[PDB]
Amino acid sequence: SQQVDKIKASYPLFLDQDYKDMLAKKRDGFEEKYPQDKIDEVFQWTTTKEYQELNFQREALTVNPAKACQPLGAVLCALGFEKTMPYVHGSQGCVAYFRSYFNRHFREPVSCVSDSMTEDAAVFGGQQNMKDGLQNCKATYKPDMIAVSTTCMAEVIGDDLNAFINNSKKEGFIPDEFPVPFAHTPSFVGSHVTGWDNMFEGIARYFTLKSMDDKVVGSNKKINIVPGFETYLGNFRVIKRMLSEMGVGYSLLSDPEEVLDTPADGQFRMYAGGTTQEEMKDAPNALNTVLLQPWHLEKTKKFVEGTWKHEVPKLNIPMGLDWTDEFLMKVSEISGQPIPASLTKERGRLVDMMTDSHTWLHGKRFALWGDPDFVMGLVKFLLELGCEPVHILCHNGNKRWKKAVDAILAASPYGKNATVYIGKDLWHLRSLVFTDKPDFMIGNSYGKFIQRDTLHKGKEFEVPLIRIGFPIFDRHHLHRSTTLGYEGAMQILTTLVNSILERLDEETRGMQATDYNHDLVR
């Protein structure tokens, strides 16, 4: 039953007595549900340490992973170029899923096409699919460039992208001068960040490999910036702003912040902004190349150091205080531009907030998960704040990254209780937060379920989640935030201290029970 003046959505309409009785009747009659006591016993067992040993013995079963497949990152990289259409050679379901994922994260239209490969292509290959798809895409959406990646279908059947595109150009389906960079992105290798690296390397090789005779390093007095897989527009904006304040010439390669933040004014823009072909062709003439996320830009680093002959600096992600300082000094050394007073004042203001909130941050325990560079930068910043990471998880990390993270942790007295896990999923993290309870979790929206499970054990065992990372689906406009630089550090610090204070306020709201500590001033 619904009242016209107060209509109830699914919550809490189904908490009404009639719906509750219907659900109880259904369960007791036709579901053959296990007894509630048995379910409670099994949940208690899953919250124990023995279940943790059984869980960490897994070798073939992955439960709730924290990574995606390569063509998603390839599409994200392709989106960062001017009037460039992402084109995935393979099945259309992959493209549908990529578009749905990016639409749910960014809340913006995402453009991508497929050649709709089927059983006929599973037997005879997808050469005709490639020809017709390239022709149709160019004729319909009029792109200046088509960036081609692959799905696991074409990777397994071993389709040859280079030969397919060459045949398409030779037979006249698309003009010979039309740029069609390509990359092989096997989803059974690596993750989405690997796909981003592969696509960027393919585009750079397409635009620079055959025309390096007339290139001189440092000729255009610019610095190349390669951001890598990034889902915060504020990060691109802060990098550009910091480079502009220093008066440093720069070329941001794969810049998608304009196409992922289009305005609503009555018209649809399929393309907006992005790196031009002139920038990509002139990139070898820069003084140097800086990779913002070096731990998933290895192929790009090899291509840049080998072909472009750029001595890429060994820089960590510009996250926190120390690494932002190191990035700024390296940029100043490379470009010969002094660091302006505005950046010094911003650093001092960040230090001031750190000094203000150190009392509330000290001693706090965090679980965290995400991509390798983001995770290691977050670990560094949390160490600088006096916080204690204990469970550090990275499903797409490797042994070298784990060694680097351990070296970072050993350098600080607050990293003595920290353990780094690579190749572990979120079921492992759920077991870890049950057996060794932290104060907070940091990660994407998939952690919310973990919090729910903790609340099932008790209010004293609940571990609140802080949404930093990708993807965030249950909150609006968090993709506009910043994690890089002093401004990103300030945003992260404000979020963390406010999460701590909201938890404290919630725990002390009981009248005559705990409200003696419900302080007005904190």
């Binding site: 619904q2 016209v4 209509i7 699914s10 189904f14 009639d18 219907m22 659900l23 259904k26 009659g29 036709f30 579901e31 549900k33 048995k38 099994v42 949940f43 899953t46 059984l54 897994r58 070798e59 073939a60 079963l61 992955t62 709730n64 992973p65 990574k67 995606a68 497949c69 084109y87 099945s91 379901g93 899923y97 749905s100 639409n103 913006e108 239209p109 497929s114 050649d115 709709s116 490969m117 089927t118 599973a122 490639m130 022709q135 149709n136 004729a139 319909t140 959406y141 799905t151 279908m153 397994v156 059974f188 993750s191 004014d265 009555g266 018209q267 649809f268 998939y446 379920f449 499970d453």
Partner: protein, 477 residues
């Protein structure tokens, strides 16, 4: 109106395509004629998509894992293959259920085999057996395992059926291998077909020799309702107050026991004909259970459906149906009185998967709103035969419409509201046209039945009449 103008617009939109793409797409766009009962002579559907045209259709894995098998709550579903498929489809569809997640319910969880290069080169049957053992170890309260195949499984030559048979015999468990590789078919329709075939072959006939279930003349099953935002519950409550007993519910908030007990019911009430007609026809031929379709979109359609269902039983069910209609009449009359002045005269364009573009028409008309365009992603010709009689004259019909085609059609027609998926939502929002998500109900619902009609009307008013649509043009432009 202006059928000639609609055809001219179709031609103008079609000019841009190359010769082969234009020729193929010409057969999938049509102008409605209610007097026509054979859509085959009018439109062509269930065909392959043209490459590089930004299609909206999914894959057979989405049709099988994401639609049919996924809502089953007491079963563990393994995405056999690389990590992406189960990750992008995890908790993406709001098929509601009651249970303890991770203990006895696993709907919003993502179980996968996490294929690597070695699994591709050397196969994944041994990995599948080890995964099944680990699943049984860590999740003892699960009541069945289904293994949903992805593209490399079908491309490398894995014998999932043998592994499922051996492991099911060993553990005395029901393990269902579903060959739902994404390259099969052209859309999710073949996924629905394959999932229904798997249900028939491995689950449906498990209690043919069992007769311990007490049967009543008023036993019915709900077929094709996936409990999107609680739709199945909202329909089931109406069926229950009418005196019937709902034994099974496929597949939203459904259990494997309900599926196995379905062949014992007296009537099948099919909600989604497109995705469940195979199993309903199989049940009719094998056990003799008649099946009929029902529409619970808006007060008129649910009155008609309730009366049609009650006609299948004796007089007591008919009296209970009349009592239910009398009880629920004032509520939807109040809803109509509140929300008809704010929605009268508006024009709607729709593009949904296979059932809702023709089901929601009556609900839209009960609020005084007219539908001028509709389309399907993967519907067959029988769906178009059903739809063509429910639409007005010279309305637009589009099958497997492209992004550019729908863009231009919306630009020319200029409706007041559009209902489609998440991939058109933000596009039409940036046009300035109100948009409603017709797959997830825009994270609202339910919309079925009397309780859902109030929510539907409130959502329609809150989106159509929102002030933000009047603020797109800056005052200095």
């Amino acid at each position: 109106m202006s059928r000639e103008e609609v055809e001219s617009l179709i031609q103008e939109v079609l000019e841009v395509y190359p010769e082969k793409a234009r020729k193929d797409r010409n057969k999938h766009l049509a102008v409605n004629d209610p007097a026509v009962t054979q859509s085959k002579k009018c439109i062509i559907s269930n065909k392959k998509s043209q490459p590089g045209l930004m299609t909206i259709r999914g894959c057979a894995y989405a049709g099988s894992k994401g639609v049919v098998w996924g809502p089953i709550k007491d079963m563990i579903h393994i995405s056999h293959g690389p990590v992406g498929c189960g990750q992008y489809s995890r908790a993406g569809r709001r098929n509601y259920y009651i249970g303890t997640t991770g203990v006895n319910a696993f709907v919003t969880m993502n179980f996968t085999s996490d294929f690597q290069e070695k699994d591709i080169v050397f196969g994944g049957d041994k990995k599948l057996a080890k995964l099944i053992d680990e699943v049984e170890t860590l999740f003892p309260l699960n009541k069945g395992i289904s293994v949903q195949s992805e593209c490399p499984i079908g491309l490398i030559g894995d014998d999932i059926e043998s592994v499922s048979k051996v492991k099911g015999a060993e553990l005395s468990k029901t393990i269902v291998p579903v060959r739902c590789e994404g390259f099969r078919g052209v859309s999710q329709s073949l996924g629905h077909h394959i999932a229904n075939d798997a249900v028939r072959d491995w689950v449906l006939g498990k209690r043919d020799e069992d007769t311990t279930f007490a049967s009543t003349p008023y036993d019915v099953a709900i077929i094709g309702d996936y409990n999107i935002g609680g739709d199945a519950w909202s329909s089931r409550i109406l069926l229950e107050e009418m005196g019937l007993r709902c034994v099974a519910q496929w597949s939203g908030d459904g259990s494997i026991s309900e599926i196995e007990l379905t062949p014992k019911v007296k009537l099948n009430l099919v909600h989604c004909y497109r995705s469940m007609n195979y199993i309903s026809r199989h049940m009719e031929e094998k056990y003799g259970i008649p099946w009929m379709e029902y529409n619970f979109f808006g007060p008129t359609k649910t009155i008609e459906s309730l009366r049609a269902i009650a006609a299948k039983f004796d007089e007591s069910i008919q009296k209970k149906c009349e009592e239910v209609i009398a009880k629920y009449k004032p509520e939807w009359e109040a809803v109509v009185a509140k929300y008809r002045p704010r929605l009268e005269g508006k024009r709607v364009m729709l593009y949904i998967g296979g059932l809702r573009p023709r089901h929601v028409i009556g609900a839209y008309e009960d609020l005084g709103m007219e539908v001028v365009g509709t389309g399907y992603e993967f519907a067959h010709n029988d769906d178009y035969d059903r739809t063509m009689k429910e639409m007005g004259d010279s309305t637009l019909l589009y099958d497997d419409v492209t992004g550019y085609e729908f863009e231009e059609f919306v630009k020319r027609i200029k409706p007041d509201l559009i209902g489609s998926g998440i991939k058109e939502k933000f596009i039409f929002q940036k046009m300035g046209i109100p948009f409603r998500e017709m797959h997830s109900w825009d994270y609202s619902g339910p919309y079925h039945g009397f309780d859902g009609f109030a929510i539907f009307a409130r959502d329609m008013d809150m989106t159509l009449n929102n002030p933000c649509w009047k603020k797109l043009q800056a005052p200095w432009e």
